[PDB]
Amino acid sequence: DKATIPSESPFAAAEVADGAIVVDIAKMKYETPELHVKVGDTVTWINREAMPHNVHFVAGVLGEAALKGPMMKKEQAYSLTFTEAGTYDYHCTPHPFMRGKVVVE
Ligand SMILES: [Cu+2]
Helix, strand or coil: CCEECCCCCCEEHHHCCCCCEEEEEECCEECCCEEEECCCCEEEEEECCCCCECCEECCCCCCCCCEECCCECCCEEEEEEECCCEEEEEECCCCCCCEEEEEEC
């Protein structure tokens, strides 16, 4: 698989690690819709609004199966550690017009 999941459950925004590469979600948008990180980096999305959101990668892009992350409520977070270079598109399952990508280099 090209990503590791540190926590299968969402966790509190206060529990996000110190060296965290944060993407905020607010106003029905991923605030950094094109993020560039390097191999081995953990990206953490934090939902800043009351409407629940997640990140969903379809099958074949991070692994054989789709990775449909858990719904994050307000001030909850979810992390993915990327282990292989490439461009990984994602969207929000209930809100497919919300789209972003992680370019791992
Ligand atoms: Cu959403």
